[PDB]
Amino acid sequence: ASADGKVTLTGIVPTALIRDAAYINVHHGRDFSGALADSGVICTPI
Amino acid sequence: LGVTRTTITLTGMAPYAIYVAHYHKMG
Amino acid sequence: GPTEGTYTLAPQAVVKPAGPVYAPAGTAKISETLGVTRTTITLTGMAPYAIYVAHYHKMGSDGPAIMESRMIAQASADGKVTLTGIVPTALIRDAAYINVHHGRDFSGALADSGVICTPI
Amino acid sequence: RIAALERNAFSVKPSLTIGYSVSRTSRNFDVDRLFPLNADGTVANNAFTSGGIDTDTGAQRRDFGDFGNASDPVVAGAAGLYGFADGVSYTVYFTDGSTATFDGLNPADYKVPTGKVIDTTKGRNGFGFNNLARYKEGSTDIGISLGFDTSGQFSQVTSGTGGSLFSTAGRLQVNQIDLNFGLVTGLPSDAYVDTNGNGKKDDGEATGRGTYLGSGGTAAILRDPAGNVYRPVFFRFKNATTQFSVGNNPVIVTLGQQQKFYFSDYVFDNNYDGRGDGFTVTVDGSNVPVIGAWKPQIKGVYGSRSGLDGTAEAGYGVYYRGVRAQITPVGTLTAGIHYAQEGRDMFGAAQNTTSTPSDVTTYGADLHGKAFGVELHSEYATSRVRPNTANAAVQTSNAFYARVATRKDNLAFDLNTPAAKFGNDTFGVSLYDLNYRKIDAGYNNVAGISEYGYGSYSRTSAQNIAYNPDTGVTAPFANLDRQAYTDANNDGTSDRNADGTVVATNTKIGQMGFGVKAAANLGPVAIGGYYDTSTGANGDNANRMTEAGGSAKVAYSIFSLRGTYNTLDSNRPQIYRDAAGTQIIGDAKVRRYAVQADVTPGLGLFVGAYYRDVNVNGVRSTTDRGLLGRGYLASSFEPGVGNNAYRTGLRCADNNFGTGTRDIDGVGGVLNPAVNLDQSRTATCFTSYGVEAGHAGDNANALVKDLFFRVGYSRVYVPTTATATTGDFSGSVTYGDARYDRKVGVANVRLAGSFSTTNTQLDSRPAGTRGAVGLIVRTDPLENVPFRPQFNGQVGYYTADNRVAAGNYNANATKYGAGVVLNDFLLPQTKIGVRYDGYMAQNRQYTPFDGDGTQGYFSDANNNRRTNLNGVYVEGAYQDLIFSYGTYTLSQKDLNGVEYGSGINNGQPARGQTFKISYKVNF
Amino acid sequence: LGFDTSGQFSQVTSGTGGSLFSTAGRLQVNQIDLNFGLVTGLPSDAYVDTNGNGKKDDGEATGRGTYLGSGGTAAILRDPAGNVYRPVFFRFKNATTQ
Amino acid sequence: RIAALERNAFSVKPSLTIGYSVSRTSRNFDVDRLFPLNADGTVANNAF
Amino acid sequence: GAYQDLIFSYGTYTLSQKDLNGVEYGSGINNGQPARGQTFKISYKVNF
Amino acid sequence: STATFDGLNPADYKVPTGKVIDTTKGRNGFGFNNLARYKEGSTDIGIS
Ligand SMILES: CCCCCCCCCCCCCCCNC(=O)[C@H](CO[C@H]1O[C@@H](CO)[C@@H](O)[C@@H](O)[C@@H]1NC(=O)CC)OP(=O)(O)OC[C@H](COC(=O)CCCCCCCCC)OC(=O)CCCCCCC
Ligand SMILES: CCCCCCCCCCCCCCCCCC(=O)N[C@@H]1[C@H](OC[C@H](OP(=O)(O)OC[C@H](COC(C)=O)OC(C)=O)C(=O)NCCCCC)O[C@@H](CO)[C@@H](O)[C@H]1O
Ligand SMILES: CC1C(O)C[C@@H](O)C(C)(C)[C@@H]1CC[C@@H](C)CCC[C@H](C)CCCC[C@H](C)CCC[C@H](C)CCC[C@H](C)CCCC(C)(C)O
Ligand SMILES: [Cu+2]
Ligand SMILES: [Cu+2]
Ligand SMILES: [Cu+2]
Ligand SMILES: [Fe+3]
Ligand SMILES: [Fe+3]
């Protein structure tokens, strides 16, 4: 998250896998190896 | 064509934290 | 045809944690042989990554600690510390409770004063 | 912030080794041949082994000595104690001051003085003597090392903007790399400075430890009077990634070195090594609107052979290109075409040397798949090679085949699965193979631009098949070659090798033919047949090899009766032994017919009677010379009801004996838990008849649970003298085997036994009686008696009366070994253990590994010598400090009793003693 | 420039061993006296001990002469831009032998 | 404490360069004299 | 040309210097052929 | 010893050193430096 909270997330995913996804949830992490610390800091439908 | 690039730009977050974001299905 | 949708995200309201629940619990196996004592304190549900100094506090609770029994270790990623120590029996004579504490440094130090204690 | 700190932080890993070692020997023999063999065949671990297990060269722990700091390999023959110890190895001095080493027990037989060297009388009489004694002076060694590992989080790369006429966006593709790097303090013993770029250590390149003094070893140590030790720090890394891919859905472009690609067999079978450096593009049209259900695909390859390489190399100034296109119009039938080309540029046409063609241009099409209940596999190719030189005279060569058969996933054709199935079980005519072949004579791996292949894989096994698993030559049919006597230097007599084998000159003839294998499944009956004729590409009958055959089985209840007829008519030369036993090259005719009946009562037992009759070149041919294996369609049946499978291969090892004469242990395999002697067959088709009962313990409802025996009797045909037409079934073989594991109480017993009363020399086994027995006991720790003892045990006896044309000698062996481990000894965490092993042998020997895949083995030799290997090994342990002590003695006497061991000829055995203190410590 | 370590590597724990059996392991903790770090350059008295005696014989190596640019003024591994390069060595001294 | 750790910590910077190149000439002339000149007088960038 | 970030560069150039007669002194081995230059590159910039 | 003459006519090599004499080793004591340069096609991965 930079130094003032300027986190910029990006990523490619085949549309076929995406199907039935309803909301892109943003969580905090415990390390750069994925993992889940907080369960939903910010989120939007689609 | 068949891939999806997604740019979630967040601001006013925590100074040096990790922000893992993915797509949660309907449930 | 670059189908593009721009959506502002809402700041949420439910931010409950996700990981090891700090619920201290465990057992002790003090085993005497030929004048030496080997103590194994396997703990679970502890802090995910923390040094856990444990020694033998004498009776007196407050009481002094026979510091020639300090067992030091750090926890894993779920909170599992395995303290192990070799102490002469004559030293641990007149000890009352094995008190586990928190370690400010791998050199020892008692950050906390007893997160868990077992009567010996 | 802590994660950021950890991402690019060093993990400091220090290592300390502490240990005391002393070892004194006088001959440096081997002791790993005394230790028990585990159920996986490995020998039991000990503290004295030198190691040396190499799978590439077949080396094992039993091929090297175990005393001193030397790992001297055992030497076969008399120089070594007949494969039991180290060689004598005199040293020969020369006039010019140079010296050589003679490996023999008698220096007078040094028949190899070089052209100008003369033996100077500097030693005894110009011959020295290399001392056979090895010493490890007792010392305690501390070894300290340090390394710096990285977090391992640098496994990704993201592309950056580029371009000159324009500018790409950047950050468009993420590539996963396989870079493993860290910091080391000291160099490995095998490091070197590669000054040529070949990537291999040439003649004394640098010995990197010698380039950077103080890196490692004891020759140089960078020190300080204060006691500090300095070691250079190096950045070590491996890059396993050489390919980078770009693009996701329709188009993917891969750039890298040694690109591996595959258009088809016969064109670009260029995988398993790759061809060179360049790029490949793959376009997948499986989502196109109009035509996407046919899964159209396009592949394109460009590259430079071997990348950049110095002149005189085949890949200098040579570049390849290609494009293939395929679809799947029906269920699984994939059809494709492909163009391939390889050529020299203006810098390769000149100053390249070698013989790479000035140009090769191959076209092809293939139709592999499974569409309508049948499986089709077709292939066509055209070469058009431009043969460099000046006139060139471009040469064309095609390769076409059309097969109705089942190909496996590894692209090998499975001829046991029908792929036709024109009916059900009651009426089940099944087509197994139906193929045609028109491979041309000039079609090799150069014609179709591939790495290897397109030639008979065996020339003794199925020789019409080019499929080579070793070099990845996936090609059903091979370019056959014609063989003939060489007669290189001498005239009038054909050239032979030292062993007597013939030397042949091979001329490629190509291949053209057809073949059908089918089977009709009746009810209680089943029948099958096969036919196959292959000529040369031109079609001349001087190279024809026809195999035809057929079998019929009837199985009902607990009875089965089979009858098989096989033929082989090869005008093609073929290399094989004649009746006398000398290899020859010449046409062959083989006619075999076998009627074998089997009965299975169902209680785990089985009985089998057979009568097999071979007929080679018109004579009764006691044993076929492997000729019947020249064809790839053999297809015998198998006993049992409801087992109507027409599997390729004549099961000649059925209901017959074994002819093994080699063994890992001293005794004839009866003491090896990884060898089942009751399941040992000869795999040679004989003209014989006999019966064989038995019993299997794995089959349920068996008399004894884990019990196997294979008692059997047989009679073998032998001609009158050596080559007479007349003969009789005079040979006789009576064999028996047994194996019973059991577990009585806490102990784990294991009994094995073998017997044989052959009358003639069958394959390599001489004519004589041969018996062997072995017992292995392994008790688990006893928790009732004090000390928690844990016993072992091992006994093995072997006898053999070899009646060879040069003697009637007896070769017997006796191995034994016992040992007890006390798991609770006085003080806490204190252990003691002792093991005594012994091995006595009459005229037997050990043959070490040959440096190839073949391993060493114990065999019978007429050496009038008796070996008496013995030893005791005591291993005690305090908490974690291990004291190992071992004393062993090897004495090899002759009939007189001269005691040749310790070959300084003083009548003393070779002796070895070792003492170690081991202590493993971790930071 | 020097790189010191935390000095927390002063202990070793034994590991399981044995061939006829297998010891438990982690049974004894030994205190060692290893002092190590990273140096950039060699001292004046360093030398290459090619015999094992542990002493500087007649002109053994003059370790600053083996690794040019380690120290002194006789040799300096330079760069036209003005950068100076010095080899990095792992220095260590082990006072524990029992 | 994190600042103290970061003060004397190494930043590990790895670099990877991947590229394919082939070039054949008989005289080795110059082609940069053909490319357009920018408003600052520099010649246009090219890959050759 | 450029796919996502992989750049394919190809270039073919010819330099011929004749005289009034037309001797074509380029490629000065004196065989009446111009100097020629061809290059092919695949470039890919990656970052850690 | 050898020298390099920079000219289209070796006969104008008016600078033979004090004691050197042209040995008829090449055509007539004068060779010819090849004017052709080659970069054999390869893919390079560099790691740092
Ligand atoms: C998006 C990028 C757009 C294209 C960029 C501009 C390039 C095209 C312009 C014409 C440029 C290409 C014109 C074709 C020259 N010919 C070649 O093929 C030569 C082959 O070498 C040698 O081979 C021998 C037998 O094989 C003989 O013929 C020799 O005589 C020859 N050597 C010589 O003496 C030198 C002539 O390769 P080269 O050394 O010149 O290498 C480079 C070539 C050409 O480069 C490309 O253009 C490939 C681009 C593919 C991207 C595919 C990826 C698509 C991504 C969506 O690359 C090849 O391999 C392809 C072969 C030609 C087919 C071109 C059509 C796709
Ligand atoms: C998805 C897309 C992937 C892209 C990557 C794949 C690229 C595919 C490229 C396909 C191009 C068409 C091929 C035509 C086949 C003609 C059939 C064919 O190969 N002919 C054979 C061969 O030919 C020689 C070749 O011909 P060629 O026309 O191939 O080369 C011209 C040109 C190359 O330009 C440059 C860089 O100089 O390449 C093209 C087409 O652009 C040539 O003139 N080179 C001179 C030198 C001679 C030695 C090679 O001559 C004989 C043997 O000496 C004989 O054996 C012929 O049968
Ligand atoms: C167009 C376009 C766009 O602009 C916007 C948007 O639509 C897109 C980005 C998707 C796009 C890109 C589309 C892109 C994906 C391209 C389409 C994909 C296909 C795949 C390309 C190749 C098609 C050709 C086909 C494969 C050839 C078929 C011929 C067979 C091979 C013949 C075999 C016969 C054999 C010889 C018989 C056997 C004989 C013997 C004797 C051997 O037995
Ligand atoms: Cu050995
Ligand atoms: Cu090359
Ligand atoms: Cu292959
Ligand atoms: Fe080399
Ligand atoms: Fe010295």
Author numbering:
A (entry chain I): 156 to 201
B (entry chain I): 53 to 79
C (entry chain L): 20 to 79, 142 to 201
D (entry chain A): 245 to 1167
E (entry chain B): 390 to 487
F (entry chain C): 245 to 292
G (entry chain C): 1120 to 1167
H (entry chain C): 342 to 389
Copy text from the publication.
The S-layer Deinoxanthin-binding complex (SDBC), one of the main units of the characteristic multilayered cell envelope of this bacterium, protects against environmental stressors and allows exchanges with the environment. The crystalline cell envelope/S-layer of D. radiodurans is made by three different multisubunit protein complexes among which the main one is the S-layer Deinoxanthin-binding complex (SDBC), composed of the xanthophyll-binding protein DR_2577 (SlpA) and at least five more accessory subunits. The SDBC is shown to be both a photoprotective system, through the xanthophyll-binding subunit DR_2577, and a chemoprotective one, by the SOD activity of the subunit DR_0644.
The atomic structure of the SDBC core was recently described showing its β-barrel organization consisting of a massive three-pores region inclusive of its ligands and cofactors (the xanthophyll carotenoid deinoxanthin, two exclusive phosphoglycolipids, the metals cations Cu2+ and Fe2+). The resulting 3D map shows that the collar region of this multiprotein complex is a trimer of the protein DR_0644, a Cu-only superoxide dismutase (SOD) identified here to be efficient in quenching reactive oxygen species. Furthermore, the collar region was also modeled and identified as the protein DR_0644, confirming previous characterizations by mass spectrometry and a previous model where the only carbon backbone was partially assigned. The identification of the SOD subunit implies that the SDBC exploits the photoprotection given by its core, the protein DR_2577, to prevent damages that are otherwise repaired by its SOD chemoprotective component, the protein DR_0644. Considering the nonselective transport properties of the SDBC and its regular organization around the entire cell surface, the ROS-scavenging ability of the collar region could efficiently and isotropically protect the bacterium from potentially adverse environmental conditions.
